[PDB]
Amino acid sequence: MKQYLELMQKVLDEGTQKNDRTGTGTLSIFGHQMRFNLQDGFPLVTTKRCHLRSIIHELLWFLQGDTNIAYLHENNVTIWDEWADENGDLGPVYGKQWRAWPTPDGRHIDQITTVLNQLKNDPDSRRIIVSAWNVGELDKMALAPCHAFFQFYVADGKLSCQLYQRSCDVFLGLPFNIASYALLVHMMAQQCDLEVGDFVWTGGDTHLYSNHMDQTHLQLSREPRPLPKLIIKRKPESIFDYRFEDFEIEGYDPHPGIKAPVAI
Amino acid sequence: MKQYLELMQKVLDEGTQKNDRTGTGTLSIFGHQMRFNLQDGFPLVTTKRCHLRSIIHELLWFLQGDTNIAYLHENNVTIWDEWADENGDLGPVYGKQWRAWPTPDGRHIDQITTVLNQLKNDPDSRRIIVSAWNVGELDKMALAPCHAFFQFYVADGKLSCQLYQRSCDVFLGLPFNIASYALLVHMMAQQCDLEVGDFVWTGGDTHLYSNHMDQTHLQLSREPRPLPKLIIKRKPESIFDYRFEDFEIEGYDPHPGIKAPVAI
Ligand SMILES: C#CCN(Cc1ccc2[nH]c(N)nc(=O)c2c1)c1ccc(C(=O)N[C@@H](CCC(=O)O)C(=O)O)cc1
Ligand SMILES: C#CCN(Cc1ccc2[nH]c(N)nc(=O)c2c1)c1ccc(C(=O)N[C@@H](CCC(=O)O)C(=O)O)cc1
Ligand SMILES: C[C@H]1O[C@@H](n2ccc(=O)[nH]c2=O)C[C@@H]1O
Ligand SMILES: C[C@H]1O[C@@H](n2ccc(=O)[nH]c2=O)C[C@@H]1O
């Protein structure tokens, strides 16, 4: 996509070499922002082939509150296996913080049905936030939340969302995280009878690992293709009632897949 | 400053008209980021006289983990009055979250000591974050945090910071928060023997109240002058024992103050 390829060229032209926990080495810039107007097409990268099947099942899993990879295995998704313990558990990550964030006095807040009552009854609220970054449970988590915090906004009968991603692997993770959120925004907009506004992405430490460099320049040599289209064949009673089958992507013509190692 | 004046102009040009919770009405955009290189000078506005005495007692009040306006009345700063109760408490806002975030199991987390040790023992960390958006305790706060989340970063011996502001009064609140956070990056860099880097400001619902149009046009017609320079006169034993005496600004020659009505 024009925004994505421009970002990669920006950490390659402006990035500094860092070191990290996986010990792999990275080129890194700090602070970046881009916008996808969702009326223009579903933001799924066309200059390498992406696997939607993993993106829809991961999102459906987050919305059910589940944090054990059993659901994901049932559906042939293996994206979280490396971080999951003996029993499939990932600890209190995204799904749990979203559906049941624990309070000091034993309550639990459901941040997804809350954001939906705000979109319905007070869409002009400046408080329409969901946060996965609970400081109090980070130590019990498999990996610390990358897509940490996000906020919805309504303007001319259209729903917009801004994510703050504190750490971004531009080659491997970012294709995934922007199609995940663009898909959450069509689901909230279908439920609130609103149109789709924009997906604003904001990055903290936005980087490219050293062992993703030739791949990065291979992708960068491709001309982006026309952006796909999301067709939803049903309007479930709730945001928690979607199924994989209700989602169709039309017009998707990517350049060939590019393979690359995942850091530990 | 040029970055700040441009956002004022982006909200008047592009802003949508919204009805906010005070009934006053706002010119509003969603999603904006501004980068400040703190080597080029202290980012205090010069097209209107900003008052650093309130900016600095509030930040030392925050680092103390105090949520009561008592200390703030002793130093003649009146910014928190109409939101405190009849005993002076604001409930667990910023300072309580920064110094003592409560787990569901009794314990507390000191996010500034956590960040101090990360900049001194793991400076390449992509988790150098402090958050004040505690979803369990939002009910308990006199006002939900506007400056909700921030992340530090170190690259070639420089300390950077990025703040996410979910709500921003451009004419009134924004000069205050830019000076406040840029001030903390100097404190942190001084304790951690680092040089100062960029101050990335990202905003969600960025807005200008309708009753602030006159003052905006007045300020938008004034030319930005040289940024001040900040001096920290002595080096304290920790970040917790600084005082108002320790801070100074040479070369700050601003335009007159500009008086504006506050909305509640
Ligand atoms: C983001 C996210 C969720 N996640 C979780 C997640 C966890 C740790 C991480 N660690 C690193 N180094 N990079 C990541 O982006 C990352 C992502 C993902 C997990 C696997 C793949 C992956 O291996 N990629 C594809 C290859 C093609 C593609 O990029 O889609 C694959 O399925 O093999 C992607 C995302
Ligand atoms: C941001 C923040 C913290 N805060 C808290 C805070 C809380 C609620 C708010 N509500 C509204 N409507 N706008 C705000 O900017 C705002 C700010 C502030 C409090 C007061 C001033 C203010 O009125 N500044 C005046 C007078 C202060 C002075 O004399 O120094 C000025 O003209 O500078 C700014 C920020
Ligand atoms: C933890 C490492 O994987 C990256 N990562 C992880 C999860 C995710 O949603 N997106 C992403 O890019 C961040 C960092 O490079
Ligand atoms: C809640 C109202 O006050 C504003 N507000 C509050 C605190 C702060 O630091 N900055 C700011 O702009 C946001 C909105 O106009």
XYZ file of C-alpha atoms and ligand atoms in Angstrom:
628
model
C 0.000 0.000 0.000
C 1.250 3.572 -0.565
C 1.410 4.316 3.222
C 3.029 1.060 4.231
C 5.785 1.128 1.510
C 6.450 4.755 2.441
C 6.888 3.777 6.115
C 9.437 1.041 5.276
C 11.416 3.441 3.136
C 11.309 5.880 6.111
C 12.821 3.523 8.709
C 15.429 2.469 6.071
C 16.340 6.109 5.260
C 15.951 7.521 8.796
C 16.390 4.500 11.116
C 19.132 3.923 13.606
C 20.507 0.450 14.353
C 19.297 -0.869 17.672
C 19.603 -4.013 19.723
C 16.683 -5.875 21.309
C 15.580 -8.681 23.629
C 15.370 -11.296 20.810
C 19.028 -10.343 20.181
C 18.383 -10.047 16.421
C 19.178 -6.383 15.743
C 16.790 -3.849 14.162
C 16.630 -0.619 12.168
C 14.385 1.704 14.231
C 12.580 5.078 14.048
C 10.306 6.402 16.916
C 6.873 7.992 16.355
C 4.963 7.619 13.092
C 1.351 8.151 11.877
C -0.603 7.186 8.766
C -4.270 7.109 7.731
C -6.330 4.726 5.713
C -9.682 6.131 4.538
C -11.816 2.974 4.611
C -14.219 4.188 1.884
C -11.217 3.673 -0.531
C -10.850 -0.093 0.056
C -9.952 -2.662 2.652
C -6.335 -2.096 3.657
C -4.774 -5.467 2.890
C -1.262 -5.281 1.390
C -1.094 -6.149 -2.227
C 2.737 -6.136 -2.662
C 3.020 -9.514 -0.896
C 0.299 -12.152 -0.244
C -1.418 -12.050 3.120
C -3.417 -14.714 4.841
C -6.893 -13.310 5.915
C -7.886 -16.621 7.576
C -5.443 -15.909 10.425
C -6.511 -12.297 10.793
C -10.263 -13.123 11.054
C -9.821 -15.998 13.524
C -7.462 -13.993 15.709
C -9.991 -11.062 15.881
C -12.973 -13.407 16.592
C -10.877 -14.976 19.427
C -10.114 -11.529 20.920
C -13.834 -10.650 20.889
C -14.831 -13.846 22.662
C -12.425 -13.074 25.620
C -10.323 -16.154 24.984
C -6.533 -16.262 25.604
C -5.814 -20.012 25.091
C -4.690 -21.162 21.606
C -7.129 -24.059 21.525
C -9.672 -22.039 19.494
C -6.920 -21.018 17.081
C -5.756 -24.627 16.589
C -9.327 -25.799 15.998
C -9.185 -23.493 12.944
C -5.599 -24.120 11.657
C -4.068 -20.940 12.973
C -0.602 -21.269 14.461
C 0.427 -17.565 14.857
C 0.624 -17.584 18.683
C 2.077 -21.081 19.378
C 5.656 -19.964 20.164
C 4.506 -17.814 23.079
C 1.954 -20.248 24.592
C 2.775 -22.492 27.542
C 2.311 -26.262 28.047
C -1.472 -25.856 28.292
C -1.963 -23.456 25.367
C -2.235 -20.416 27.689
C -0.967 -16.958 26.896
C -1.896 -15.301 30.218
C -4.136 -12.170 30.516
C -3.438 -10.712 27.016
C -5.741 -8.776 24.577
C -8.898 -10.879 24.795
C -8.983 -10.761 28.609
C -8.114 -7.030 29.045
C -10.841 -6.220 26.471
C -13.762 -8.303 27.900
C -12.928 -8.422 31.592
C -10.308 -5.943 32.862
C -10.071 -6.650 36.680
C -10.555 -3.687 39.074
C -8.987 -3.301 42.610
C -12.411 -3.964 44.184
C -13.202 -7.273 42.401
C -15.325 -5.900 39.464
C -14.701 -6.592 35.813
C -15.275 -4.081 33.005
C -16.213 -5.072 29.535
C -14.527 -2.599 27.300
C -16.102 -3.838 24.051
C -19.802 -3.640 25.058
C -18.928 -0.316 26.772
C -17.496 1.188 23.548
C -20.700 0.015 21.833
C -23.011 1.771 24.313
C -20.904 4.910 23.862
C -21.148 4.701 20.047
C -24.930 4.205 20.369
C -25.788 6.807 23.088
C -22.880 9.225 23.223
C -20.850 9.091 19.900
C -19.559 12.622 20.598
C -17.705 11.313 23.671
C -13.926 11.960 23.820
C -13.623 8.929 26.117
C -14.298 6.011 23.616
C -11.204 3.966 24.484
C -10.250 0.285 24.795
C -6.851 -0.456 26.433
C -5.029 -3.689 26.591
C -2.153 -2.111 28.535
C -3.004 -3.079 32.131
C 0.170 -2.360 34.024
C -1.075 -4.528 36.907
C -1.127 -7.786 34.900
C 1.855 -7.430 32.521
C 4.001 -9.967 34.378
C 1.412 -12.664 33.997
C 1.316 -12.068 30.184
C 3.068 -14.192 27.507
C 4.235 -11.184 25.516
C 3.527 -7.483 26.432
C 0.650 -5.864 24.358
C 1.908 -4.380 21.088
C -1.379 -2.853 19.951
C -1.835 -1.297 23.297
C -4.527 1.310 23.146
C -7.161 2.506 20.595
C -9.866 5.143 20.273
C -13.057 5.585 18.207
C -14.523 8.864 16.961
C -17.610 9.780 15.042
C -17.888 12.745 12.698
C -20.207 12.892 9.668
C -21.982 9.656 10.409
C -18.750 7.707 10.050
C -16.639 5.731 12.486
C -12.930 6.380 12.835
C -10.311 4.647 14.962
C -6.822 5.463 16.058
C -4.510 2.665 17.300
C -1.302 3.202 19.297
C 1.076 0.396 18.750
C 4.058 0.713 21.131
C 6.218 -1.640 19.104
C 5.790 -2.601 15.442
C 7.603 -5.196 13.300
C 6.858 -3.411 9.961
C 7.610 -6.463 7.787
C 5.865 -9.230 9.615
C 3.372 -7.785 12.107
C 2.019 -4.563 10.632
C 0.156 -6.037 7.502
C -1.691 -8.151 10.102
C -2.519 -5.434 12.683
C -3.839 -2.908 10.209
C -6.213 -5.400 8.436
C -7.351 -6.611 11.971
C -8.357 -3.164 13.092
C -9.923 -2.112 9.758
C -12.063 -5.251 10.126
C -13.030 -4.367 13.779
C -14.075 -0.903 12.536
C -16.446 -2.445 9.853
C -17.934 -4.668 12.477
C -18.590 -1.762 14.961
C -19.888 0.417 12.109
C -22.244 -2.469 10.977
C -23.601 -2.800 14.539
C -24.017 0.978 15.146
C -25.531 1.600 11.718
C -22.683 3.972 10.977
C -20.492 4.299 7.934
C -16.728 3.672 7.965
C -14.499 6.660 8.517
C -10.693 6.307 8.792
C -8.178 4.035 10.512
C -5.388 6.215 11.908
C -2.311 4.109 12.895
C 0.244 5.513 15.391
C 3.574 3.773 16.144
C 6.030 3.967 19.003
C 9.203 1.977 18.243
C 8.572 1.247 14.601
C 11.238 -1.103 13.245
C 12.457 -3.573 10.681
C 14.650 -6.513 11.841
C 18.067 -7.001 10.252
C 17.107 -10.441 8.906
C 14.153 -8.889 7.033
C 16.288 -6.487 4.924
C 16.516 -8.166 1.499
C 12.801 -9.003 1.705
C 12.039 -5.387 2.549
C 13.864 -4.184 -0.605
C 12.264 -6.919 -2.735
C 8.768 -5.734 -1.672
C 9.713 -2.119 -2.076
C 10.441 -2.794 -5.770
C 6.768 -3.633 -6.447
C 3.985 -1.394 -7.611
C 0.926 -1.511 -5.242
C -2.139 -2.990 -6.794
C -5.916 -1.920 -6.453
C -7.101 -2.389 -2.907
C -9.615 -5.299 -2.092
C -13.248 -4.897 -0.949
C -14.943 -6.195 2.222
C -18.387 -7.669 1.728
C -20.265 -8.757 4.873
C -23.112 -11.108 4.101
C -25.000 -10.746 7.432
C -25.670 -8.426 10.428
C -25.406 -10.577 13.615
C -27.440 -9.659 16.696
C -24.254 -8.583 18.481
C -20.592 -7.881 17.765
C -19.798 -11.240 19.470
C -21.943 -13.278 17.031
C -19.806 -13.004 13.874
C -18.491 -16.050 12.115
C -15.673 -16.419 9.659
C -18.035 -17.315 6.762
C -19.870 -13.949 6.906
C -16.785 -12.318 5.463
C -15.936 -12.086 1.815
C -13.019 -10.094 0.344
C -13.449 -9.272 -3.356
C -10.904 -8.100 -5.929
C -7.708 -9.307 -4.129
C -4.752 -9.686 -6.486
C -1.422 -9.684 -4.502
C 2.127 -10.024 -5.798
C 3.729 -13.393 -4.622
C 4.211 -14.173 -0.883
C 7.566 -13.200 0.738
C 8.755 -15.523 3.619
C 10.770 -14.258 6.635
C 11.837 -15.389 10.200
C 9.973 -14.492 13.413
C 11.969 -13.134 16.305
C 11.963 -14.975 19.517
C 5.460 27.934 17.375
C 5.137 26.888 13.694
C 3.928 23.284 14.398
C 1.370 24.544 16.936
C 0.060 27.411 14.796
C -0.435 24.933 11.919
C -2.709 22.701 13.956
C -4.761 25.773 14.978
C -5.147 26.430 11.283
C -5.900 22.727 10.513
C -8.767 22.671 13.044
C -10.301 25.961 11.772
C -9.940 24.714 8.150
C -10.811 21.025 8.394
C -12.650 20.742 11.772
C -16.162 19.325 12.016
C -18.634 20.975 14.364
C -19.467 18.878 17.406
C -21.683 19.203 20.456
C -19.604 18.529 23.553
C -20.562 17.684 27.122
C -20.496 21.399 28.308
C -22.991 22.447 25.632
C -20.519 24.922 24.096
C -19.697 23.225 20.796
C -16.312 22.515 19.346
C -14.325 22.543 16.053
C -12.806 19.083 16.045
C -10.450 16.727 14.191
C -9.329 13.182 14.984
C -5.696 12.105 14.848
C -2.725 14.419 14.630
C 0.986 14.181 15.501
C 3.617 16.855 16.096
C 7.376 16.266 16.581
C 9.536 18.662 18.603
C 13.330 18.467 18.523
C 14.267 19.509 22.077
C 17.823 20.388 20.980
C 16.389 23.331 18.984
C 15.003 24.932 22.235
C 12.287 24.543 24.932
C 8.836 24.151 23.203
C 7.030 26.925 25.113
C 4.760 29.177 22.978
C 5.932 32.624 22.110
C 2.845 34.003 20.341
C 1.188 34.233 23.745
C 2.659 34.454 27.219
C 2.540 31.112 28.893
C 3.035 30.908 32.587
C 5.532 28.267 33.648
C 4.805 28.523 37.413
C 1.664 26.359 37.126
C 3.218 24.025 34.528
C 6.027 23.114 36.898
C 4.237 22.767 40.302
C 1.677 20.495 38.684
C 4.439 18.198 37.273
C 6.203 18.005 40.696
C 2.758 17.376 42.267
C 2.242 14.488 39.767
C 5.712 12.981 40.548
C 4.926 13.050 44.268
C 1.881 10.813 43.759
C -0.422 13.329 45.285
C -3.995 13.759 44.035
C -5.099 16.568 46.358
C -4.912 20.291 45.458
C -3.489 21.179 48.941
C 0.201 21.414 47.784
C -1.106 23.299 44.734
C -2.854 25.958 46.850
C 0.263 26.520 48.933
C 2.019 27.471 45.709
C -0.802 29.707 44.403
C -1.651 27.497 41.410
C -5.343 27.348 40.793
C -5.675 24.987 37.781
C -7.489 22.148 39.651
C -10.044 23.926 41.906
C -13.453 23.434 40.335
C -12.802 19.659 39.952
C -11.700 18.859 43.488
C -14.210 17.911 46.214
C -14.860 19.884 49.475
C -11.792 18.213 51.021
C -9.468 19.014 48.094
C -9.262 15.435 46.609
C -9.555 14.639 42.910
C -9.739 10.875 43.511
C -6.895 8.702 42.016
C -5.922 10.829 38.955
C -2.366 11.030 37.402
C -0.039 11.061 40.439
C -1.773 8.023 41.994
C -1.503 6.085 38.720
C 2.144 7.070 38.058
C 3.411 6.335 41.550
C 1.018 3.675 42.810
C -1.018 1.840 40.163
C -3.149 -0.744 42.108
C -3.155 -4.472 41.045
C -6.397 -6.610 41.648
C -4.377 -8.445 44.342
C -3.565 -5.607 46.875
C -0.045 -4.602 45.638
C 1.005 -1.325 43.922
C 3.266 -0.489 40.944
C 5.547 2.553 40.805
C 5.701 3.331 37.139
C 8.312 6.183 37.361
C 10.823 4.028 39.380
C 10.043 1.296 36.827
C 10.876 3.681 33.997
C 14.000 5.048 35.823
C 15.443 1.533 36.099
C 14.537 0.711 32.475
C 16.429 3.819 31.174
C 19.406 2.891 33.402
C 19.468 -0.923 32.943
C 17.573 -1.656 29.752
C 17.566 1.509 27.535
C 16.765 -0.389 24.287
C 13.431 -1.594 25.785
C 10.294 -1.040 23.744
C 8.124 -1.228 26.932
C 9.311 2.035 28.642
C 5.753 3.129 29.247
C 3.713 4.882 31.853
C -0.038 4.917 31.619
C -2.683 6.723 33.665
C -5.659 5.138 31.867
C -6.685 2.695 34.629
C -10.044 1.361 33.416
C -10.832 -0.125 36.882
C -10.457 3.277 38.584
C -11.879 5.669 35.965
C -15.181 5.817 37.987
C -13.173 7.090 40.924
C -11.499 9.966 39.080
C -12.758 13.623 39.172
C -12.015 13.792 35.479
C -10.762 10.950 33.159
C -7.062 11.547 32.080
C -6.557 13.705 28.933
C -2.833 12.881 28.780
C -3.283 9.195 29.165
C -0.267 7.308 27.961
C 3.372 7.936 27.120
C 6.442 6.082 26.012
C 10.126 6.751 26.324
C 12.808 5.693 23.870
C 16.655 5.892 23.621
C 18.613 5.700 20.278
C 22.137 7.223 20.135
C 22.493 8.434 23.685
C 19.269 10.614 23.358
C 15.974 10.413 25.288
C 12.723 10.716 23.323
C 9.082 10.669 24.499
C 5.679 10.309 22.855
C 2.469 11.346 24.543
C -1.015 10.267 23.517
C -3.603 12.878 24.336
C -7.180 11.619 23.811
C -8.700 15.003 24.220
C -7.086 18.355 23.564
C -8.211 21.949 23.921
C -5.858 23.412 21.329
C -6.025 27.072 22.476
C -6.036 26.371 26.187
C -4.699 22.943 27.111
C -2.118 22.183 24.413
C 0.672 24.775 25.362
C 0.462 23.532 28.904
C 0.942 19.787 28.105
C 3.736 20.405 25.546
C 5.714 22.434 28.138
C 4.884 19.832 30.879
C 6.105 16.728 29.074
C 9.114 18.396 27.484
C 9.998 19.383 31.051
C 9.820 15.770 32.230
C 12.069 14.529 29.373
C 14.694 17.026 30.622
C 14.370 15.712 34.224
C 14.560 12.062 33.135
C 17.462 12.670 30.732
C 19.366 14.513 33.541
C 18.891 11.672 36.039
C 19.725 9.053 33.424
C 22.768 10.802 31.869
C 21.327 11.079 28.426
C 21.008 13.889 25.913
C 17.450 15.107 24.881
C 15.710 13.899 21.706
C 12.299 14.474 20.095
C 9.019 15.069 21.885
C 6.356 13.398 19.773
C 2.830 14.627 20.600
C -0.074 12.542 19.149
C -3.711 13.484 19.640
C -7.085 11.905 19.321
C -10.006 14.381 19.415
C -8.090 17.617 18.972
C -10.397 20.648 19.235
C -11.008 24.376 19.484
C -14.078 25.568 21.446
C -16.446 27.891 19.503
C -15.983 30.632 22.143
C -12.234 30.634 21.440
C -12.377 31.805 17.786
C -11.434 35.472 18.439
C -8.381 34.673 20.505
C -7.281 32.053 17.960
C -7.419 34.591 15.051
C -5.552 37.092 17.213
C -2.820 34.479 18.043
C -2.782 33.090 14.518
C -1.711 36.541 13.268
C 1.383 36.791 15.481
C 4.848 35.677 14.256
C 6.626 32.929 16.258
C 9.772 34.094 18.091
C 12.977 32.197 19.283
C 12.335 29.279 21.614
C 13.592 29.691 25.185
C 16.365 27.608 26.749
C 15.911 25.567 29.821
C 18.394 25.443 32.672
C 18.204 22.953 35.540
C 20.344 24.744 38.183
C 21.247 21.806 40.434
C 21.200 17.975 40.016
C 18.918 16.316 42.621
C 19.491 12.984 44.287
C 16.482 11.566 42.416
C 13.616 12.661 40.147
C 11.414 12.911 43.266
C 13.297 15.724 44.964
C 13.424 18.542 42.457
C 12.020 21.987 43.375
C 10.692 25.056 41.532
C 14.012 26.856 42.139
C 15.828 24.368 39.926
C 14.275 25.597 36.628
C 14.958 28.670 34.505
C 14.255 30.076 30.973
C 16.605 32.395 29.118
C 15.663 34.028 25.821
C 11.867 33.764 26.273
C 10.492 36.927 24.670
C 6.702 36.300 24.091
C 3.712 38.249 22.789
C 1.027 39.381 25.402
C -0.850 36.741 27.443
C -4.359 36.427 25.766
C -7.267 35.860 28.138
C -9.717 33.043 27.381
C -12.888 31.627 29.112
C -12.539 28.077 30.547
C -15.241 25.502 29.847
C -16.508 23.164 32.601
C 0.652 -9.047 14.234
C 0.230 -10.107 14.607
C -0.123 -11.387 15.188
N 1.096 -12.193 15.336
C 1.649 -12.254 16.718
C 2.999 -11.677 16.919
C 3.767 -12.136 18.003
C 5.162 -11.926 18.052
C 5.817 -11.226 17.028
N 7.165 -11.116 16.990
C 7.774 -10.588 15.909
N 9.086 -10.653 15.773
N 7.060 -10.003 14.947
C 5.727 -9.955 15.005
O 5.044 -9.112 14.169
C 5.051 -10.700 15.970
C 3.662 -10.930 15.922
C 1.649 -12.802 14.253
C 2.255 -14.061 14.375
C 2.908 -14.663 13.289
C 2.963 -14.015 12.048
C 3.747 -14.618 10.969
O 4.562 -15.544 11.126
N 3.512 -14.094 9.718
C 2.928 -14.906 8.570
C 3.810 -14.687 7.318
C 3.143 -13.712 6.353
C 2.555 -12.495 7.052
O 3.309 -11.618 7.471
O 1.337 -12.467 7.214
C 2.675 -16.395 8.754
O 1.516 -16.705 9.025
O 3.600 -17.200 8.664
C 2.322 -12.781 11.890
C 1.672 -12.183 12.984
C -3.557 20.946 30.145
C -3.615 20.996 31.341
C -3.851 21.141 32.769
N -5.115 21.848 32.985
C -6.296 21.030 33.335
C -7.468 21.113 32.424
C -8.680 20.605 32.912
C -9.880 20.853 32.233
C -9.885 21.596 31.048
N -11.052 21.910 30.442
C -11.060 22.668 29.329
N -12.204 23.135 28.855
N -9.907 22.992 28.721
C -8.717 22.720 29.279
O -7.577 23.093 28.605
C -8.667 22.058 30.512
C -7.472 21.827 31.205
C -5.186 23.181 32.817
C -5.909 23.991 33.713
C -6.076 25.357 33.449
C -5.515 25.903 32.291
C -5.768 27.274 31.962
O -6.912 27.757 32.041
N -4.660 28.033 31.615
C -4.806 29.550 31.677
C -4.618 30.070 33.127
C -3.527 29.346 33.910
C -2.362 30.201 34.389
O -2.592 31.333 34.822
O -1.223 29.723 34.353
C -3.838 30.281 30.781
O -4.279 31.253 30.177
O -2.697 29.846 30.662
C -4.759 25.133 31.418
C -4.595 23.769 31.684
C 7.054 -8.191 20.055
C 7.651 -7.937 18.637
O 6.655 -8.381 17.619
C 5.905 -7.212 17.121
N 4.432 -7.350 17.068
C 3.837 -8.102 17.984
C 2.444 -8.165 18.036
C 1.642 -7.434 17.060
O 0.418 -7.342 17.095
N 2.376 -6.702 16.140
C 3.754 -6.645 16.083
O 4.321 -6.052 15.173
C 6.431 -6.059 17.997
C 7.873 -6.440 18.305
O 8.652 -6.416 17.110
C -11.984 17.598 29.112
C -11.840 18.938 28.388
O -10.684 19.676 28.984
C -9.485 19.448 28.084
N -8.138 19.136 28.642
C -8.080 18.655 29.864
C -6.840 18.371 30.459
C -5.590 18.616 29.740
O -4.459 18.411 30.189
N -5.772 19.121 28.458
C -7.001 19.400 27.878
O -7.036 19.832 26.742
C -9.981 18.430 27.054
C -11.460 18.760 26.896
O -11.624 20.022 26.243
